[PDB]
Design an enzyme around this catalytic site. Structure first.
Site, PDB file in Angstrom:
ATOM      1  N   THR A  61       3.007 -13.770  23.810  1.00  0.00           N
ATOM      2  CA  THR A  61       3.349 -13.341  25.261  1.00  0.00           C
ATOM      3  C   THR A  61       3.148 -11.615  25.302  1.00  0.00           C
ATOM      4  O   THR A  61       3.408 -10.861  24.419  1.00  0.00           O
ATOM      5  CB  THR A  61       4.689 -13.612  25.660  1.00  0.00           C
ATOM      6  OG1 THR A  61       4.900 -15.106  25.762  1.00  0.00           O
ATOM      7  CG2 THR A  61       4.965 -13.003  27.122  1.00  0.00           C
ATOM      8  N   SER A  62       2.550 -11.243  26.524  1.00  0.00           N
ATOM      9  CA  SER A  62       2.181  -9.990  26.715  1.00  0.00           C
ATOM     10  C   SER A  62       2.596  -9.681  28.132  1.00  0.00           C
ATOM     11  O   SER A  62       1.902  -9.928  28.819  1.00  0.00           O
ATOM     12  CB  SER A  62       0.676  -9.512  26.372  1.00  0.00           C
ATOM     13  OG  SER A  62       0.447  -9.711  25.156  1.00  0.00           O
TER      14      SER A  62
END
Ligand SMILES: *[C@@](C)(CO)[C@](*)(O)[C@H](Cc1ccccc1)NC(=O)[C@H](Cc1c[nH]c2ccccc12)NC(=O)[C@@H](C)NC(=O)CN1CCOCC1
Ligand SMILES: *[C@@](C)(CO)[C@](*)(O)[C@H](Cc1ccccc1)NC(=O)[C@H](Cc1c[nH]c2ccccc12)NC(=O)[C@@H](C)NC(=O)CN1CCOCC1
Ligand SMILES: [Mg+2]
Ligand SMILES: [Mg+2]
Ligand SMILES: [Mg+2]
Ligand SMILES: [Mg+2]
Lengths: 204, 196, 226, 222, 211, 195, 233, 195, 196
Positions: free
Chosen positions: I1-2
């Site tokens: 995830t970013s």
């Protein structure tokens, strides 16, 4: 250690033409030690038959429990319970112990008194229903029974032919399992007569 | 640790921080992680200090003996000797090494050798615990055929950020410039690079 | 198991294989994995078989009571919310991985839900041991603005990929189509590509082959009069 | 941690006739829930009218067969092209297996052929080298499904003669090659239904005084 | 398995069952747990089938070489010891082998128990395997030195039957041997299924079982 | 504790139970009676984990004695055995299960028949002509299988029991310090003081 | 015994009427980090064989050197090194398979999964797999890692059995391989857009294609997807 | 194996050793002699892990017998005990140590004195008037501490030994099947056939 | 995830990738990680999807009930409710949440709530597995009081690099703009951001 294989035992059920059959071995053991050759694993509540494999204390306990529940069902409903309904009761009762289950492999067999339709069903220790047309197997020699049933079975067998098929499936499966045997019983079930036969088998 | 090596027009520059930790204690704040294996072939060390020192000492021995017999070795040859040690002894080592050197024929070359013992020739390379924080920055800001002054600024800015975010990295920024002109050592102190 | 869900023009379709396993052994060759939550909300389940059934029946029961209380037809978001909050509470111990789909007054919907309580929206989804084989097909052939007939084809093709290539999946293909403004059509055994060939021999025995010790009539009737 | 063993599934079946022998095996190769190949031969003609199959971990199975084939080659070189009898092959294989008693070939091995009197012979091995001559043997994943069926339909176990009621057994009449192949095909069709690692194809090798013959049959691919 | 062997007036009796297990699965109904080392030496088997076969067939190699060098048959004492010394080389390595070395030599009949630990015991009566306790019960109450060959053969046969019945990992069939000074003598393969019913009727035993 | 045996003959049930009690490496007692009278014609012997055995036995005894007083009537051996089984089956899924195996020997005055029930700590009940718990059966069942008849007298039952104890004393590694023998018949419960 | 550090993901392949196709992406992963973006994992051996390797990259580079040395050694005292006594795909595979099984037997494996694709002297197609355990198998389609789960199902729709091989053209087979590589890019978290593809035909020889990209990707439908259930905005 | 006792009296050494051998849950033999004659006036009893005991004993026996033939002379009990200790101390740091405890009873013909040496598997040697290995000493040493004199006759030594065995038979949980007793004096080694 | 959230002159913008993984398998490539808890209070989710969904649903319930009684809640208030759940249930949760909202009085605000349940008010925040690779880039390129177009470019470039290096991140870049003007959703596809 594995509760499902301490006491040993097997149950198999088959459908035929306007008939069903259910059979079990008679052994009860403590692992390698054989304790009893009279431990029948098939019970009946009216015209509905229940076979139970696995841990013997739970087999005994569940029989007493379903006797309890079916006797009350009958008092309130004013009629005997049917196989389809009983199958749901078994499933319900097993899943209510989802995280502390009875270590059993139940098998239901019977004929609906109204429709006349033969019925068999199997469960896992937690209630998942396996409603088969052909046969149901349970026990320590379930792999052996699957191989025998799957090759010997054919649909629409007559009661006296079905007897031979289920008997041979049980006997030869039990003779390849150390924890099964020591006698065998076969129930042949028709709409309004039930015959029970004890088989002669090797006692080792 | 935060280490990097960058090729540019006139050759190659190696860069490193100077922090050595034993847990959260800084055992040495003025470490020299830029080590010489040949006149114009240097390496940056990361991982177990014992392992990387032992390796670099052995490589230096191999290249000294190579030179006595066959003349000046290539940067590729030096990287192969590093690799051979790191790969064959991978079960007992924790070493992440960047090899950098200058030829007149091949000019500036950079090889990175991560944990497994694989070799990767690159335009520039980053390694060490602090490298993770500057993958984005370095990728965005790197250009091929930069000038010496541009390359120094690139390494200075990059390691500045690595030091900023990584606790295992810090101290001074050391650099080694490898060109035809010779070998130049550089040093940059906190008061210089922290205000970038 | 292999289960899929595919959206289309005026609704949504789900499908599943019919194999159930106990390790490497096939327990049931014609299992039913497509469960009914409400008339126009159906879900397909993978993972622990009893859990997918039980959790589906429980939420389906509560949805029916809700529908009666509110005098409204049940929504898919209601089943979704009730399912995830139930599964989350049991912290993954109820091993139910479901694809939930249906039509309601809001429109057509397609969700997936994991055992730990995480939900997911999509136009095409797949779950189970054969989800990768099925998803490869979906990613290859899915497009926007599918017709009903195209979506059923895509769904059953995705299940077949699981049947043939995944050992945890097999036998037949079940389908349920939920179209807007229509009754949901449950297509049990939509495909039957795994019928057993005739056996070479009959193993029917001669009567009297088995040795018997005792015989007896079993009294199943009640206590009699007179 | 590295696990040097694996399970490639499969199932094999050997039956000894009066003047023939069969060795059958499915052609499916697997890891976990994936299919590697739908046709990967498992039963091999090793020379000298001997057929062999090592079921379990394919890498160890291929190595053993390869070594036994090699052992046959060197038996000819060292002993003036003498034919390796089935009983001598069996004993040789025991020593091949026990060489790795402390890092076993993870396979269940069956060989088949004819004895020195021309009669059908089947020999069965465990992974560490215990062997026995047998009339009938199933090995591998679905061995427990098939063996009871063979006790019943090959040795007529628990079968008696009608009218006597358990007093007189079914007599042990011999089986023809056509009758045996029926039992083999029905065994694998039944095993394919209830075992997920069994399917795709069935390859049978039949051994007679005339030589080694092959027969192939399709199985369900699910 | 269940094995037994005992010395008596007219030599030594050796009886074994025929079952083989793979957990709960009965892998073999009829395996041979006796090895004819030579015309005057026998070896029983209990434990790992591979170990029993390999090491006792290797013992037979070593016993034959003894005859060629010395021009004389090996004693039971010496044969049992060679085997126990083999076990001591692979001491701790994980072998599983329990065996009786039965025979007739110059000192008369001989019986030795040997196991994977290197144990070597001389004695008049032994029983090994999962079902040995059941066999001992019958043996201890009915054994005499003054037994007839016919009665002795029956005792060993009946003792295995006892174990085959109660022990889940014992059964299939009974193999009998009688060792004399003219050599050993095989006394047949006896199916337990048929033998059980026969003994039940003739002897009157196993009253608890219905037949 | 260690060894408990049971045999049902023509007109009585005979229970034999070891006398030894061991703490650590020392045998504290060699005359311990591992049994409780539940009712005038019902006897229960027991064996299992230290403490749990007597506790459980005395708890069962109190319940049956309470029933007897309330109804002025003796429960059948079958009824008592079923009550005991339920208590053990209830116990096995408890926080701390009672680790006790029992034999219940009783004479049914209604049917005029002796009855022997074997129940293990899981709640596994079986009616038997002869029974045992633990390793006792491994040594003794072969003798009982051979010598047992259902028409045996009490004296013949005791002789067969002596043979079982002799076999145990020969082939068991543990010294269990002999057995206390008790007979249950129509006249009630009595102890054989010389064995 | 070790653990893989820098790794390469799926290698996929299939047979067609006149030869074989093999493909693999150009990524060298360092756990979840997509560290190296220019790694070639297809390695040609002569003009009749391509070896595709997945798993540990340091071990791949070792194998790459063994093959390079194998070619050198085959040419020694061999006037027919570029003709009758040239290296065959079956020779190269059996060598690797011997090495892989020996290494696992010393409990020091080469942590790889290999597919040897090529065409033999007699024009026959060769396609066989081998891995760190020394396990070998052959099939009309072969794939390693994720490719086994996602690519094989798609490639088996084209060539489901042996009789489908003569019916499959190179255009159809390449199309299927390229589609499979796109699907792997959608769904494999350790994959890259950039890949290499090799074709070994019995007529047109070895064609080695570099710097290929996954194209014609569907993403537009993502704009309509909102929340995880009840969210509308 | 289990119990081995030793007592040194005025003019002899007496060794008592159990007769039982157990495999699994079954007693295979009840007449086993846990001893080897090393020389005419030196006897060694032994106890420990299965197999190792006899192997070690026979290996020591062969070495002492070899020495006797080479020099035509009997080693003193002290010399033999030191040789045995060294072999065990050598063994304890081996790849797989020999798990054997021994008592060495000998009569020194030069000094005309009986001698008893106790050596455990680690190579721990002690000369004693009476000794034991394992748990045997826990039960018996209190009796020996009380009743032992150095001027005791062989007959008095046997009576005190009987009392020790009786105490073991009362308070030990294990049945060791009695003991074989052997006496070592100036005339050599002999076995007491009735005990 | 970013994931990231950035304040600027006219308000605040949330940004996220769209990849959800189960090991190395991408279970969902078009995930919406930007979730609404109130009209102009949104959050970015990282960690266990089950945990973060359950939390955000509970928070949405609390703020709906707050609004019914006391009117529009502040962004600080929303972050406090998140915190209270994350902190008191820290032993059974794996949730890393960034909270972002727009008031007319307070304008754009950003709060980050890492694993422990602590709260940190910031000008901008980054989180998720892919955030590690852009600490250097974001620190160097962030400015206060940027324009909307500048802020979009900053998030686009930042998440582009996070996606480039992190295998657990990928797919499309989703963004949510929070200003007085209203709520604007944005989306950027690979072909756009990969060539940056
Ligand atoms: C594929 C066959 C892969 O399993 C499907 O998901 C299928 C789903 C399904 C759903 C509804 C009806 C029928 C089938 N799942 C199964 O068949 C499932 C496989 C399985 C077995 N053990 C599992 C553990 C965790 C997840 C899946 C498991 N079968 C069952 O669950 C049945 C056979 N029950 C059991 O095997 C009994 N288990 C109960 C829980 O404790 C372990 C044993
Ligand atoms: C009882 C049946 C114990 O279970 C016997 O001891 C029996 C002894 C025996 C001896 C020689 C030949 C055959 C049988 N033992 C076994 O059957 C043995 C039991 C067993 C299983 N795992 C064990 C581990 C350690 C010790 C014993 C073990 N079973 C086997 O050895 C199994 C694994 N092997 C075979 O069944 C081999 N078959 C190959 C083909 O020929 C017939 C035997
Ligand atoms: Mg038995
Ligand atoms: Mg710092
Ligand atoms: Mg399949
Ligand atoms: Mg000492």
């Amino acid at each position: 250690s594995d509760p499902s294989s301490i006491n040993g035992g097997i149950v198999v059920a088959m459908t035929g033409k306007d008939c069903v059959a259910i059979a079990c071995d008679l052994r009860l053991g403590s692992q390698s030690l054989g304790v009893s050759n009279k431990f029948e694993k098939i019970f009946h509540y009216g015209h509905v038959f229940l076979g139970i494999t696995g841990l013997a204390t739970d087999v005994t306990t569940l029989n007493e429990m379903f006797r309890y529940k079916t006797n009350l069902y009958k008092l309130k409903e004013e009629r005997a319970i049917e196989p389809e309904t009983f199958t749901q009761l078994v499933s319900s009762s097993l899943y209510e112990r989802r995280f502390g289950p009875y270590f059993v492999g139940p098998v239901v067999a019977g004929i609906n008194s109204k429709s006349g339709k033969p019925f068999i069903a199997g469960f896992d220790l937690i209630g998942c229903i396996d409603e088969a047309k052909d046969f149901i197997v349970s026990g320590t020699a379930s792999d052996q029974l699957f191989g025998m049933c799957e090759s010997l079975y054919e649909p629409n067998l007559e009661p006296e032919d079905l007897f031979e098929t289920i008997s041979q499936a049980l006997l030869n499966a039990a003779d390849r399992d150390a924890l099964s045997g020591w006698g065998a019983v076969v129930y042949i079930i028709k709409k309004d007569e039930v015959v029970k036969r004890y088989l002669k088998m090797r006692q080792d | 640790t935060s280490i990097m090596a960058v090729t540019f027009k006139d050759g190659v520059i190696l860069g490193a921080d100077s922090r050595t930790t034993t847990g959260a204690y800084i055992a040495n704040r003025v470490t020299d992680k830029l080590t010489r294996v040949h006149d114009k072939i240097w390496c940056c060390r990361s991982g177990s200090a014992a392992d990387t020192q032992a390796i670099a000492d052995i490589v230096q021995y191999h290249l000294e003996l190579y030179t006595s017999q066959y003349g000046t070795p290539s940067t590729e040859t030096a990287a192969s000797v590093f690799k051979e040690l790191c790969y064959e002894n991978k079960d007992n080592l924790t070493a992440g090494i960047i090899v950098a050197g200058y030829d007149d024929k091949n000019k500036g070359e950079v090889y990175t050798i991560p944990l497994g013992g694989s070799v990767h020739k690159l335009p520039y390379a980053i390694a060490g615990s602090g490298s993770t924080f500057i993958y984005g920055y370095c990728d965005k800001n790197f250009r091929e055929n930069m000038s010496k002054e541009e390359t120094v600024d690139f390494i200075k800015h990059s390691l500045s950020q690595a030091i900023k975010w990584d606790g295992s990295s810090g101290g001074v920024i050391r650099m080694v410039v490898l060109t035809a002109a010779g070998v130049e050592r550089l040093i940059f102190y906190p008061d210089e690079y922290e205000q970038l | 198991t292999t289960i899929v869900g595919v959206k289309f023009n005026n609704g949504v379709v789900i499908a599943a294989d019919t194999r159930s396993t106990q390790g490497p052994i096939v327990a049931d060759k014609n299992c039913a994995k497509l469960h009914r939550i409400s008339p126009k909300i159906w879900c397909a389940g993978a993972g622990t078989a009893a859990d997918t059934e039980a959790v589906t029946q429980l939420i389906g029961s509560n949805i029916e009571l809700h529908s009666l209380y509110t005098s409204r037809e049940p929504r898919v978001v209601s089943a979704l919310q009730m399912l995830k909050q139930h599964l989350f509470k049991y912290q993954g111990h109820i091993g139910a991985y479901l694809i939930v789909a249906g039509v309601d007054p809001t429109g057509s919907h397609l969700f997936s839900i994991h055992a730990h309580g995480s939900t997911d929206v999509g136009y095409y989804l797949s779950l189970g041991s054969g989800s990768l084989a099925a998803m490869a097909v979906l990613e290859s052939h899915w497009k926007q603005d599918l017709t009903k007939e195209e979506a059923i084809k895509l769904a059953s093709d995705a299940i077949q990929a699981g049947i043939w290539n995944d050992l945890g999946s097999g036998s037949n293909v079940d389908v349920c189509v939920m179209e807007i403004g229509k009754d949901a059509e449950y297509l049990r055994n939509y495909l039957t590509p795994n019928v057993r060939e005739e056996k070479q021999k009959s193993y029917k025995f001669p009567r009297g082959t088995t040795a018997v010790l005792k015989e007896s009539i079993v009294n199943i009737c009640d206590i009699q009069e007179e | 941690q590295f696990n040097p063993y694996g399970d490639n599934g499969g199932t094999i079946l050997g039956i000894a006739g009066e003047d023939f022998a069969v060795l059958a095996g499915d052609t499916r190769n697997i890891t976990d829930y994936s299919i590697n190949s739908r046709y990967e031969p498992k039963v091999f003609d090793c020379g000298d009218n001997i057929v062999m199959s090592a079921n379990g971990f394919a890498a160890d199975g291929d190595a053993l067969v390869k070594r036994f084939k090699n052992s046959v080659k060197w038996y000819h070189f060292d002993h003036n092209d003498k034919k390796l009898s089935i009983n001598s092959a069996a004993r040789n294989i025991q020593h091949l297996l026990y060489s790795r008693r402390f890092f076993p070939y993870y396979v269940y091995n069956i060989i088949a052929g004819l004895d020195e009197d021309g009669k059908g012979a089947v020999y069965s091995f465990d992974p560490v080298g215990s062997y026995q001559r047998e009339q009938c043997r199933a090995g591998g994943a679905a061995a427990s499904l098939i063996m009871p069926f063979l006790d019943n339909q090959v040795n007529f176990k628990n079968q008696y003669e009608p009218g006597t009621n358990g007093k007189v057994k079914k007599p042990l009449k011999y089986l023809s090659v056509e009758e045996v192949i029926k039992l083999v095909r029905d065994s694998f069709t039944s095993a394919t239904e209830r075992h997920i690692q069994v399917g795709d194809g069935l390859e049978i090798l039949i051994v007679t005084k005339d030589g080694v013959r092959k027969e192939f049959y399709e199985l369900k691919r699910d | 398995t269940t094995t037994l062997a005992f010395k008596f007036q007219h030599g030594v009796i050796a009886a074994v069952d025929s079952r083989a297990s793979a957990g709960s699965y009965i892998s073999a109904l009829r395996v041979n747990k006796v090895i004819e080392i030579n015309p005057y030496l026998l070896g029983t088997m209990s434990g790992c089938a591979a170990d029993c076969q390999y090491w006792e067939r290797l013992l037979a190699k070593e016993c034959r070489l003894y005859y060629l060098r010395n021009g004389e048959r090996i004693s039971v004492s010496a044969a049992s010891k060679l085997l126990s010394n083999m076990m001591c080389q692979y001491r701790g390595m994980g072998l599983s082998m329990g065996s009786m070395i039965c025979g007739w030599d110059k000192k008369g009949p001989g019986l030795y128990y040997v196991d994977e630990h290197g144990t070597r015991l001389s004695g008049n009566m032994f029983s090994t395997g999962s079902g040995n306790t059941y066999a001992y019960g019958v043996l201890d109450s009915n054994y005499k030195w003054d037994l007839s060959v016919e009665d002795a053969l029956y005792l060993g046969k009946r003792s295995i039957l006892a174990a085959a019945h109660r022990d889940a990992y014992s059964g299939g069939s009974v193999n009998l041997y009688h060792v004399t000074e003219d050599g050993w003598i095989y006394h047949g393969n006896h199916d337990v299924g048929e033998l059980f019913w026969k003994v039940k009727e003739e002897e009157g035993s196993f009253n608890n079982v219905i037949g | 504790m260690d060894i408990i045996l049971g045999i049902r003959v023509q007109d009585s049930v005979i229970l034999a139970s070891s006398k030894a009690v061991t703490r650590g490496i020392s045998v504290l007692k060699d005359s311990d009676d591992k049994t409780r009278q539940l009712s005038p014609h019902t006897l229960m012997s027991f064996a299992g984990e230290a403490g749990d055995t007597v506790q459980f036995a005395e708890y069962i005894q109190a319940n049956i004695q309470l029933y007897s007083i309330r109804e002025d009537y003796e429960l059948s051996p079958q009824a008592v055995s079923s009550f005991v089984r339920q208590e053990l089956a209830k116990s096995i899924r408890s926080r701390r299960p009672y680790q006790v195996n029992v034999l219940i020997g009783g004479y049914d005055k209604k049917k005029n028949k002796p009855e022997l029930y074997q129940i293990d700590y899981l709640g596994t009940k079986v009616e038997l002509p002869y029974g045992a718990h633990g390793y006792s059966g491994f040594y003794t069942f072969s003798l009982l299988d051979h010598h047992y008849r259902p028409d045996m007298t009490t004296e013949e039952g005791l002789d067969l029991l002596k043979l079982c104890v002799q076999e145990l004393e020969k082939r068991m590694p543990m010294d269990f310090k002999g057995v206390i023998v008790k007979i249950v018949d129509k006249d009630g419960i009595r102890q054989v003081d010389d064995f | 015994t070790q653990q893989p550090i820098v790794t390469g993901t799926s290698v996929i392949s299939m047979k067609y009427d006149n030869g074989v196709i093999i493909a693999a992406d150009n990524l060298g992963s360092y756990g979840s980090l997509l560290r190296f973006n220019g790694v070639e994992r297809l390695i040609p051996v002569g003009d009749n064989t391509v070896v595709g390797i997945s798993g540990d990259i340091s071990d791949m580079q070792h194998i790459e050197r063994l093959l390079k040395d194998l070619v050198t050694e085959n040419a020694y005292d061999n006037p027919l090194a570029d003709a009758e006594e040239a290296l065959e795909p079956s020779y190269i595979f059996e060598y690797l398979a011997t090495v892989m099984y020996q290494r696992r037997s010393k409990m020091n494996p080469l942590w790889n999964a290999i597919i040897v694709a090529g065409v033999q002297s007699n024009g026959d197609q060769f396609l066989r797999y081998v891995n760190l355990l020394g396990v070998t198998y052959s099939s009309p389609t072969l794939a390693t890692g994720f490719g086994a789960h996602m690519a094989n199902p798609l490639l088996r729709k084209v060539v489901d059995r042996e009789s489908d091989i003569p019916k499959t053209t190179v255009q159809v087979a390449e199309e299927a391989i390229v589609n499979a590589m796109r699907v792997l890019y959608y769904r494999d978290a350790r994959s890259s857009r950039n890949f290499s593809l090799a074709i070994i035909d019995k007529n047109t020889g070895l064609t080695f294609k570099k710097n290929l990209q996954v194209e014609n990707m569907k993403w537009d439908f993502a704009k309509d997807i909102k929340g995880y259930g009840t969210q509308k905005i």
